[PDB]
Amino acid sequence: FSTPVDIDIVLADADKRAMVDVKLDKNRREKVPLYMDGESVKGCVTVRPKDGKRLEHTGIKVQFIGTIEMFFDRGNHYEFLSLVQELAAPGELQHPQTFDFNFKNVEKQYESYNGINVKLRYFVRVTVSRRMADVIREKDIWVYSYRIPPELNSSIKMDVGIEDCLHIEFEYSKSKYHLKDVIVGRIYFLLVRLKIKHMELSIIRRETTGVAPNQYNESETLVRFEIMDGSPSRGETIPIRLFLGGFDLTPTFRDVNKKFSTRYYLSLVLIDEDARRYFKQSEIILYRQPPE
Amino acid sequence: FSTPVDIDIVLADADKRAMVDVKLDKNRREKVPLYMDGESVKGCVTVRPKDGKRLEHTGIKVQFIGTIEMFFDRGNHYEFLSLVQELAAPGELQHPQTFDFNFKNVEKQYESYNGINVKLRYFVRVTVSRRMADVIREKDIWVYSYRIPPELNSSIKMDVGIEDCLHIEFEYSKSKYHLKDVIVGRIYFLLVRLKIKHMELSIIRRETTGVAPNQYNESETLVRFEIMDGSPSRGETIPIRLFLGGFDLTPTFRDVNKKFSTRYYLSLVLIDEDARRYFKQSEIILYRQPPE
Numbered sequence: 001f002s003t004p005v006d007i008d009i010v011l012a013d014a015d016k017r018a019m020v021d022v023k024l025d026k027n028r029r030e031k032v033p034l035y036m037d038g039e040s041v042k043g044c045v046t047v048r049p050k051d052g053k054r055l056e057h058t059g060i061k062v063q064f065i066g067t068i069e070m071f072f073d074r075g076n077h078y079e080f081l082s083l084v085q086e087l088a089a090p091g092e093l094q095h096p097q098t099f100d101f102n103f104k105n106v107e108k109q110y111e112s113y114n115g116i117n118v119k120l121r122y123f124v125r126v127t128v129s130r131r132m133a134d135v136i137r138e139k140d141i142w143v144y145s146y147r148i149p150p151e152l153n154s155s156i157k158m159d160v161g162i163e164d165c166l167h168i169e170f171e172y173s174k175s176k177y178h179l180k181d182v183i184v185g186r187i188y189f190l191l192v193r194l195k196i197k198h199m200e201l202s203i204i205r206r207e208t209t210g211v212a213p214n215q216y217n218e219s220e221t222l223v224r225f226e227i228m229d230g231s232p233s234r235g236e237t238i239p240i241r242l243f244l245g246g247f248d249l250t251p252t253f254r255d256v257n258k259k260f261s262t263r264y265y266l267s268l269v270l271i272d273e274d275a276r277r278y279f280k281q282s283e284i285i286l287y288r289q290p291p292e
Numbered sequence: 293f294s295t296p297v298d299i300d301i302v303l304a305d306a307d308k309r310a311m312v313d314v315k316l317d318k319n320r321r322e323k324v325p326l327y328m329d330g331e332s333v334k335g336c337v338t339v340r341p342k343d344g345k346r347l348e349h350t351g352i353k354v355q356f357i358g359t360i361e362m363f364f365d366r367g368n369h370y371e372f373l374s375l376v377q378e379l380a381a382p383g384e385l386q387h388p389q390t391f392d393f394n395f396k397n398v399e400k401q402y403e404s405y406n407g408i409n410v411k412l413r414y415f416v417r418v419t420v421s422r423r424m425a426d427v428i429r430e431k432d433i434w435v436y437s438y439r440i441p442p443e444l445n446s447s448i449k450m451d452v453g454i455e456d457c458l459h460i461e462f463e464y465s466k467s468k469y470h471l472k473d474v475i476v477g478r479i480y481f482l483l484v485r486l487k488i489k490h491m492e493l494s495i496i497r498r499e500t501t502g503v504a505p506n507q508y509n510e511s512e513t514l515v516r517f518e519i520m521d522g523s524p525s526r527g528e529t530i531p532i533r534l535f536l537g538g539f540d541l542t543p544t545f546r547d548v549n550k551k552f553s554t555r556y557y558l559s560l561v562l563i564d565e566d567a568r569r570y571f572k573q574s575e576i577i578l579y580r581q582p583p584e
Contacts, residue, residue, distance in 0.1 A: 038396070058503060059550060082374030083399065089550030090503020104330070105397040107375065211350060211382020258351060258381030 004051045005093070007126050007137035009062075011043035020142040023248075024114050032140045035108065035122075041141075042102035045087060045126050049096055058129040060088035064103045066110070066143070068259055069119040070209060080257050081107060081122075110256050111145040111288070116218040117209040118260045145251070146290040150176050159190070160280050167191035170268060172240070172282070178289040179249055183266070185240035189232050195273040199228035201242055202269060203249070204281070208261040222247050244286075252285045296343045297385070299418050299429035301354075303335035312434040315540075316406050324432045327400065327414075333433075334394035337379060337418050341388055350421040352380035356395045358402070358435070360551055361411040362501060372549050373399060373414075402548050403437040403580070408510040409501040410552045437543070438582040442468050451482070452572050459483035462560060464532070464574070470581040471541055475558070477532035481524050487565040491520035493534055494561060495541070496573070500553040514539050536578075544577045 011017065011033060020034040035041070045062055049055070066081035083106065087099040113120040122143050128135040153174045161167035167190040172183055187199065202225070207218040223246075228238050253262040264286050270278045303309065303325060312326040327333070337354055341347070358373035375398065379391040405412040414435050420427040445466045453459035459482040464475055479491065494517070499510040515538075520530050545554040556578050562570045 078376070078378075079374065080376035080378065082371065082376070084370070084372035084374070084549075085401075086370075086372065086549035086551065089547065090506060092504075104399045107396045107398075109377075212384075214382060255381065257376075257378035259378065 002050060003135075004049065004053055004055055005128065005135060006048045006050060007128070007135065008046045008048065009043060009124055009126060009137065009139040010046060011041075014043070020144070022112070022114055022142065030140070032142045034142050034144065035106075036144060036146065037108045038105055039108075040102060040104055041106050041124070042100075045099045045101060047093065047097050047099075047128075049093065055093040055128075056091075056130070057088075057093065058090045058131070059086065060099070060128050061086050061126070062099075062101050063125045063127070064106060064122075065125055066108060066122045067120075068257055069121070070259065071117050078257070078259070080109070108143045110143070111251060111253065112142045113250060113253065113256075113262065115207045115260075115262065117216055118207060120256065144288060147287045148290055150287075156282055156284075158280075158282075161191070162194075162278060165191075165193050166270070166278060170280070172266060172284070174284075176285040176287060177244060178287055179251065180245045180289070182244065183240060183242040185242075187227070187238040187240065187268070189234055189236045189238075192232060192234055194276075194278075196228070196231045197271050197273050197275075198226055198230070199238070199268070199270045201225045201227050201240060202267040203242075203244075203247060204265040204267050205249070206261075206263045206265065208263065209259070211258065222249065249286055251288050294342060295427075296341065296345055296347055297420065297427060298340045298342060299420070299427065300338045300340065301335060301416055301418060301429065301431040302338060303333075306335070312436070314404070314406055314434065322432070324434045326434050326436065327398075328436060328438065329400045330397055331400075332394060332396055333398050333416070334392075337391045337393060339385065339389050339391075339420075341385065347385040347420075348383075348422070349380075349385065350382045350423070351378065352391070352420050353378050353418070354391075354393050355417045355419070356398060356414075357417055358400060358414045359412075360549055361413070362551065363409050370549070370551070372401070400435045402435070403543060403545065404434045405542060405545065405548075405554065407499045407552075407554065409508055410499060412548065436580060439579045440582055442579075448574055448576075450572075450574075453483070454486075454570060457483075457485050458562070458570060462572070464558060464576070466576075468577040468579060469536060470579055471543065472537045472581070474536065475532060475534040477534075479519070479530040479532065479560070481526055481528045481530075484524060484526055486568075486570075488520070488523045489563050489565050489567075490518055490522070491530070491560070491562045493517045493519050493532060494559040495534075495536075495539060496557040496559050497541070498553075498555045498557065500555065501551070503550065514541065541578055543580050 018034045019031050022030045062085050064083040067079045070076040083103050085101050122141040124139040126137045153176050156172040159169045169188040172185040203223040205220045205222050209216045225242050227240050264284050265281050266284050267281045310326045311323050314322045354377050356375040359371045362368040375395050377393050414433040416431040418429045445468050448464040451461045461480040464477040495515040497512045501508045517534050519532050556576050557573050558576050559573045
């Protein structure tokens with residue numbers, strides 16, 4: 001036999017509309033249509049019958065859903081957006097039928113995310129209601145969030161050290177970088193009484209999930225970029241130029257629906273000849289640039 | 293003791309915004325703020341603590357809901373619109389706190405209705421999530437639907453009768469009347485071989501609930517308006533002028549979310565001297581006029 005009916009969802013702007021990729025578990029890349037906050041979502045639900053039989057139903061509806069999924073558990077799923085359009089009353093289907101739908105000016109407050117303990121995703125869900133088992137079809141969507149240049153973008157500049165052993169001033173040109181921006185910086189050496197083998201700059205991603213003492217932090221190290229080979233002396237200046245376009249980062253996400261945060265840190269690491277390791281971590285905000 | 297916490301919801305336009313009344317069971321009239329399709333819903337959630345204790349919670353959210361309730365049963369409730377804003381992560385409350393909220397450009401596809409087997413209502417729902425029993429506060433809203441003058445509004449004109457006994461032509465000036473419009477019409481008598489005591493014009497409301505053979509029809513007679521006293525002869529013309537503003541009707545609602553219909557009929561009734569009753573029913577569309 002198979003299914004008596006197959007549901008497909010075709011958008012009205014399906015040819016012209018842009019699509020975007022998502023990295024999922026074990027290097028998989030999905031591609032879905034792309035939307036932003038305030039756009040209308042409209043198209044058609046196409047019902048393809050497959051048998052010459054009849055389908056008794058107690059209603060057909062289409063829903064636009066945005067939801068946050070935590071820890072791979074269905075009981076922790078929270079819909080932050082739900083919109084319904086009823087497409088048909090209780091009845092029968094004997095032949096193919098199509099139904100229009102339009103969700104007017106749809107709010108989409110968060111960017112889509114696929115992480116470790118957290119997913120945030122948007123989809124269209126069509127439901128054909130039946131007496132004991134519904135026929136359900138999901139259709140996934142990417143939503144981006146956009147942001148213009150910030151009013152204030154201060155340089156990150158600091159003196160740090162291990163007392164009487166290593167004193168350094170480091171500088172990074174901004175606090176806020178767009179996803180295809182460049183870390184321009186320098187390291188300046190004030191006091192050096194240790195034997196430095198190499199120095200690297202690391203971009204660390206932290207996913208923070210939960211509320212209050214229920215906090216799980218997942219940490220991933222997305223670059224290790226060597227910026228110095230060998231032992232400097234005092235008065236030595238080391239230039240940093242690190243291109244972010246080589247690492248495909250997600251934006252900074254802060255307290256999203258009061259459930260999770262995704263944060264980015266520059267971690268400067270110096271290693272001595274005996275393999276001792278000296279570090280300083282600094283938060284950087286990553287943002288998605290609106291194209292002009 | 294009492295409650296540890298009381299939740300109140302105050303809109304940002306609360307002073308300037310118009311309010312509207314609803315007739316509910318046993319002559320009760322509620323009054324709630326008034327909205328239309330496409331308006332944003334924004335304001336503040338005000339938490340008044342009442343005890344000097346502490347409130348542990350696993351999150352605070354506000355939802356905008358539009359739902360259809362059938363047959364006084366909670367298991368038949370269908371949300372056709374759901375929007376969520378998370379206001380706080382898991383934590384504690386020890387003192388009063390207020391939280392802003394804004395639902396951008398909110399779709400509100402149907403007019404609010406309180407009927408017999410059917411309710412359609414919109415509300416804001418605040419939820420403070422707790423370990424075993426949530427603190428929940430609803431805040432009800434009226435939504436109207438508006439419509440400009442129709443492209444086609446034909447007069448309803450017909451010849452009807454009981455053969456060789458009574459032949460009449462009736463005319464009503466429109467098929468579509470606004471809620472404060474006037475039925476202007478006439479009855480014209482072609483053949484009269486019965487002894488007519490009186491003639492009345494009735495506005496009948498029908499509420500139709502369910503899908504397919506699951507159809508319940510509730511019928512209510514909202515006016516009985518006498519238009520003739522006594523026995524006419526052939527060639528006699530009886531004028532009708534019936535003002536709809538005296539009866540506070542709801543608009544015509546057709547196949548709302550594929551779950552219900554509310555429909556209006558003009559029923560013309562003639563009564564003979566022996567109390568025999570001759571009738572003709574005609575559908576009329578009632579609509580809510582947009583003010584200029």
